[PDB]
Scaffold this motif. Structure first.
Motif, PDB file in Angstrom:
ATOM      1  N   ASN A  49       5.645  -3.415  -9.441  1.00 33.13           N
ATOM      2  CA  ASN A  49       4.762  -3.613 -11.510  1.00 33.13           C
ATOM      3  C   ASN A  49       3.953  -4.423 -11.339  1.00 33.13           C
ATOM      4  O   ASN A  49       4.026  -5.452 -12.362  1.00 33.13           O
ATOM      5  CB  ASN A  49       6.043  -3.906 -12.244  1.00 33.13           C
ATOM      6  N   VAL A  50       2.663  -4.814 -10.247  1.00 36.63           N
ATOM      7  CA  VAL A  50       2.247  -5.432 -10.502  1.00 36.63           C
ATOM      8  C   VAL A  50       0.859  -5.172 -10.259  1.00 36.63           C
ATOM      9  O   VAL A  50       0.897  -3.897  -9.575  1.00 36.63           O
ATOM     10  CB  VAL A  50       2.682  -7.134  -8.879  1.00 36.63           C
ATOM     11  N   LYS A  51       0.306  -5.202 -10.342  1.00 35.40           N
ATOM     12  CA  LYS A  51      -1.581  -4.966 -10.125  1.00 35.40           C
ATOM     13  C   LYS A  51      -1.669  -3.400 -10.658  1.00 35.40           C
ATOM     14  O   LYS A  51      -2.085  -2.501  -9.684  1.00 35.40           O
ATOM     15  CB  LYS A  51      -2.250  -5.177  -8.785  1.00 35.40           C
ATOM     16  N   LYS A  52      -0.470  -2.925 -11.461  1.00 26.29           N
ATOM     17  CA  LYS A  52      -0.475  -1.424 -11.748  1.00 26.29           C
ATOM     18  C   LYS A  52      -1.703  -1.016 -12.121  1.00 26.29           C
ATOM     19  O   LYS A  52      -2.223   0.467 -11.663  1.00 26.29           O
ATOM     20  CB  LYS A  52       0.626  -1.824 -12.962  1.00 26.29           C
ATOM     21  N   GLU A  53      -2.277  -1.091 -13.306  1.00 27.00           N
ATOM     22  CA  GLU A  53      -3.562  -0.164 -13.338  1.00 27.00           C
ATOM     23  C   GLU A  53      -4.539  -0.024 -11.979  1.00 27.00           C
ATOM     24  O   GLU A  53      -5.074   0.983 -11.872  1.00 27.00           O
ATOM     25  CB  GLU A  53      -4.241  -0.411 -14.787  1.00 27.00           C
ATOM     26  N   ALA A  54      -4.878  -0.672 -11.171  1.00 27.78           N
ATOM     27  CA  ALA A  54      -5.460  -0.540  -9.720  1.00 27.78           C
ATOM     28  C   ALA A  54      -4.461   0.339  -9.342  1.00 27.78           C
ATOM     29  O   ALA A  54      -5.463   1.175  -8.148  1.00 27.78           O
ATOM     30  CB  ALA A  54      -5.658  -1.701  -9.203  1.00 27.78           C
ATOM     31  N   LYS A  55      -3.426   0.139  -9.155  1.00 27.20           N
ATOM     32  CA  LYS A  55      -2.332   0.256  -7.830  1.00 27.20           C
ATOM     33  C   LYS A  55      -3.041   2.330  -8.242  1.00 27.20           C
ATOM     34  O   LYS A  55      -2.992   2.697  -7.537  1.00 27.20           O
ATOM     35  CB  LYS A  55      -0.822   0.562  -8.252  1.00 27.20           C
TER      36      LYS A  55
ATOM     37  N   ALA B 136       5.614   1.289  -9.173  1.00 25.33           N
ATOM     38  CA  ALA B 136       6.232   0.914  -9.515  1.00 25.33           C
ATOM     39  C   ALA B 136       6.907   0.869  -8.418  1.00 25.33           C
ATOM     40  O   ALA B 136       8.183   0.005  -7.563  1.00 25.33           O
ATOM     41  CB  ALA B 136       7.624   1.897 -11.122  1.00 25.33           C
ATOM     42  N   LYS B 137       6.537   0.769  -7.154  1.00 20.18           N
ATOM     43  CA  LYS B 137       7.048   0.771  -5.328  1.00 20.18           C
ATOM     44  C   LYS B 137       7.332   0.006  -5.380  1.00 20.18           C
ATOM     45  O   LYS B 137       6.177  -1.470  -5.104  1.00 20.18           O
ATOM     46  CB  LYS B 137       6.234   1.777  -4.842  1.00 20.18           C
ATOM     47  N   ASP B 138       8.126  -0.745  -4.448  1.00 19.55           N
ATOM     48  CA  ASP B 138       8.283  -2.136  -3.670  1.00 19.55           C
ATOM     49  C   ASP B 138       7.909  -2.168  -2.639  1.00 19.55           C
ATOM     50  O   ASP B 138       8.054  -1.696  -1.422  1.00 19.55           O
ATOM     51  CB  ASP B 138       9.595  -2.209  -3.638  1.00 19.55           C
ATOM     52  N   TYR B 139       6.009  -2.018  -2.412  1.00 22.51           N
ATOM     53  CA  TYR B 139       4.683  -1.547  -1.249  1.00 22.51           C
ATOM     54  C   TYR B 139       5.177  -2.596  -0.079  1.00 22.51           C
ATOM     55  O   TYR B 139       4.968  -3.128   1.204  1.00 22.51           O
ATOM     56  CB  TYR B 139       3.636  -1.584  -1.268  1.00 22.51           C
ATOM     57  N   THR B 140       6.652  -4.450   0.050  1.00 23.42           N
ATOM     58  CA  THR B 140       6.170  -5.228   0.543  1.00 23.42           C
ATOM     59  C   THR B 140       6.785  -5.735   1.832  1.00 23.42           C
ATOM     60  O   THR B 140       6.395  -6.147   2.705  1.00 23.42           O
ATOM     61  CB  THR B 140       6.944  -6.595  -0.270  1.00 23.42           C
ATOM     62  N   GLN B 141       7.538  -4.085   2.210  1.00 24.34           N
ATOM     63  CA  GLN B 141       7.825  -4.478   3.971  1.00 24.34           C
ATOM     64  C   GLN B 141       7.772  -3.249   4.312  1.00 24.34           C
ATOM     65  O   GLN B 141       8.203  -2.222   5.100  1.00 24.34           O
ATOM     66  CB  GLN B 141       9.371  -3.990   3.337  1.00 24.34           C
ATOM     67  N   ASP B 142       6.529  -2.159   3.679  1.00 21.36           N
ATOM     68  CA  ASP B 142       5.243  -1.108   4.116  1.00 21.36           C
ATOM     69  C   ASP B 142       4.891  -0.984   5.234  1.00 21.36           C
ATOM     70  O   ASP B 142       3.934  -1.993   5.172  1.00 21.36           O
ATOM     71  CB  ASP B 142       4.622  -0.614   3.310  1.00 21.36           C
ATOM     72  N   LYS B 143       5.326  -0.508   6.853  1.00 22.09           N
ATOM     73  CA  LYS B 143       4.294  -0.541   7.783  1.00 22.09           C
ATOM     74  C   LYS B 143       2.756  -0.187   7.009  1.00 22.09           C
ATOM     75  O   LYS B 143       1.635  -0.452   8.456  1.00 22.09           O
ATOM     76  CB  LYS B 143       4.626  -0.523   8.874  1.00 22.09           C
ATOM     77  N   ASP B 144       2.404   0.302   6.496  1.00 25.52           N
ATOM     78  CA  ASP B 144       1.067   1.034   5.541  1.00 25.52           C
ATOM     79  C   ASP B 144       0.310   0.110   5.577  1.00 25.52           C
ATOM     80  O   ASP B 144      -0.670   0.620   4.528  1.00 25.52           O
ATOM     81  CB  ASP B 144       1.205   2.731   5.400  1.00 25.52           C
ATOM     82  N   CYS B 145       1.273  -0.805   4.587  1.00 22.84           N
ATOM     83  CA  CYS B 145       0.230  -1.835   3.815  1.00 22.84           C
ATOM     84  C   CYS B 145      -0.137  -3.531   4.336  1.00 22.84           C
ATOM     85  O   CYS B 145      -0.604  -3.871   4.236  1.00 22.84           O
ATOM     86  CB  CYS B 145       1.271  -1.980   2.116  1.00 22.84           C
TER      87      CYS B 145
END
Ligand code: HEM
Ligand code: HEM
Ligand code: HEM
Ligand code: HEM
Length: 211
Positions: free
Chosen positions: A37-43, A51-60
């Protein structure tokens, strides 16, 4: 040349002014962008889940963190705050081997006026160029001017929105994107010398915060 990354600790200790300006930049806040839920419109525009938690996603994470995939860099397995967000070494290079000379030379120069050639720092891995480093993160998309682009791709490119067209010669000159430049006494000199170095230093804010 691959020295291990260590993180921003000592750089920020000896370079408080720069680390102070840096902590406000978007690079410093990089990992925030990956939270839900951060920087939602650009996402949404880039077709990413707001709304996804990408903080541990190796693609990010590889691009919102220091030296991901490199000796001593950030790992998802065991996060280290000194290596989270794109920090000093993401532009200046892994500094396990070159900060040593930053100390020694500083003292030599303060004691007897001696100077050190940048060549020694570049040999020990310091980056004075820095376009290839930025490019790995900013121009990692098929069709960009950077060779060797491979998944995971930068999801923010001109196709998503034109603001994302990366131009090093213009962007290295935005202190809000890099950080404010402060006056050097010049303990280091000579080649390899950054092409805008004299220009940055010609207009730098006066030094401050000890050494
Ligand atoms: C993985 C799917 C991933 C996510 C999620 C992610 C998010 C993200 C956000 C929200 C921003 C801010 C966008 C805005 O306009 O405010 C952002 C910005 C950049 N990213 Fe990223 N990002 C993910 C992955 C990756 C990967 C794998 C790379 C590097 C190959 C990468 C790079 C960048 C860059 C560069 C930016 C800056 C764009 C610009 O302002 O010019 N991201 N990311
Ligand atoms: C991390 C907090 C960090 C530190 C510390 C740091 C220091 C630093 C110094 C001391 C200089 C030279 C003097 C000046 O203030 O200009 C310097 C110069 C540049 N930096 Fe830096 N820097 C840190 C981080 C970063 C990051 C993340 C980037 C890239 C987005 C970056 C870039 C630059 C650039 C460009 C310069 C100019 C180089 C030159 O004139 O020779 N720095 N930084
Ligand atoms: C190399 C010297 C370099 C430059 C130049 C550069 C520029 C840059 C700009 C102008 C932005 C936009 C900032 C803003 O809108 O306020 C930006 C943003 C991100 N960058 Fe960058 N960047 C350089 C280098 C690197 C490197 C090496 C990485 C990857 C480790 C990287 C990553 C990012 C990311 C991510 C962002 C977005 C921050 C966010 O909002 O999440 N950059 N960069
Ligand atoms: C941490 C790995 C780290 C970074 C990054 C960093 C960068 C840096 C730059 C870019 C310069 C300018 C070199 C140039 O003229 O092109 C610079 C200069 C000095 N540094 Fe540094 N530095 C890092 C770490 C450290 C540490 C830990 C110390 C202190 C023990 C230190 C000291 C110095 C000194 C002194 C200089 C010269 C200042 C001058 O006015 O000439 N650095 N550093």
């Amino acid at each position: 040349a691959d020295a291990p990354f260590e993180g921003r600790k000592k750089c920020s200790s000896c370079h408080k002014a720069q680390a102070q300006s840096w902590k406000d930049t978007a690079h410093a806040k990089a990992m925030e962008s990956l939270k839900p839920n951060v920087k939602k419109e650009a996402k949404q525009k880039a077709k990413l889940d707001p709304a996804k938690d990408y903080t541990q996603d190796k693609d990010c994470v590889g691009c919102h963190v220091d030296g991901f995939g490199q000796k001593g860099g950030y790992t998802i397995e065991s996060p280290k705050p000194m290596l989270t967000g794109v920090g000093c070494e993401s532009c200046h290079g892994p500094g396990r081997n070159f900060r040593g000379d930053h100390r020694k030379s500083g003292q030599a120069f303060e004691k007897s006026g001696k100077k050190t050639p940048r060549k020694d720092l570049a040999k020990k891995g310091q980056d004075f160029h820095f376009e290839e480093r930025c490019s790995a993160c900013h121009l990692n998309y098929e069709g960009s001017p950077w060779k060797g682009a491979k998944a995971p791709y930068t999801p923010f490119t001109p196709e998503v929105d034109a603001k994302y067209t990366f131009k090093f010669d213009e962007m290295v000159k935005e202190v809000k994107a890099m950080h404010e430049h402060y006056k050097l006494e010049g303990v280091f000199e000579g080649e390899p010398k950054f092409k805008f170095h004299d220009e940055f230093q010609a207009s730098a804010k006066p030094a401050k915060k000890g050494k």
